[PDB]
Amino acid sequence: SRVAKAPVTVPNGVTVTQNGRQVEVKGSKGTLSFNLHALVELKQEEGKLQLAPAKESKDAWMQAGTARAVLNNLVKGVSEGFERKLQLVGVGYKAAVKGTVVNLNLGYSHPIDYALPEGVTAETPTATEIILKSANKQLLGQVAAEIRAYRSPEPYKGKGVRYSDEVILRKEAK
RNA sequence: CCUCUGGUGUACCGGUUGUGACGCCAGUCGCAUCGCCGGGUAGCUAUGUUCGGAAGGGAUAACCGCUGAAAGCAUCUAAGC
Secondary structure, three states: OOOHHEEEEEEOEEEEEEEEEEEEEEEEOOEEEEOOOEEEEEEEEEOOOEEEEEOOOHHHHHHHHHHHHHHHHHHEEEEEOOEEEEEEEEEOOOEEEOEEEEEEEOOOOEEEEEOOOOOOEEEEOOOOOEEEEOOOOHHHHHHHHHHHHHOOOOOOOOOEEOOOOOOOOOOOOO
């Protein structure tokens, strides 16, 4: 359980407060919440944080490791946040951002308007690239996946919506 | 369901054959598959008319995922979604 053994350090501004099972993290970007499992327990000494099993059970160890990973991700999100920089590749494929709704022309008869969930932001340096920024890694990844679902990449020519840091399998007809 | 198009419609109207009768003519009636033939009001009816199988919401199958440890990596999963 090396991940669980490895502790996490508060940056400075963000503050973590535990009431009951619920745990709240307040930061410059925003406020986030988490639910602790029964077996794992948390102790905050200095800016350092420690999570350990209540019992030596392997279930408790794995839950403590998962809690450590989640809390580290939450701390990173509140301190800085994350960006996903999705990209669209094709001919005639375009995108734009207006308010909280992103309008995409992806080769279908009708343009697709996607309403971003609260807590995420989108900007468009170019019609072929969208930058999605958020403090919640899980929600941000979910939104990115939903957007890419509309037109995921196709193998023969690579047309569609692709993550830049993704390997596209390529195939040739006949 | 019967406004329209039709069918039927032996208590509605008419044309006509044989015979009998009402004293006779004229005019009528009975019987002959409603004697036979031509139409036909309401009602019932289809082949006639109108309408319907919508659109939505929740959970979910195969499948596709997000984040994530066991197992420093990886992983749709054991937590969560």
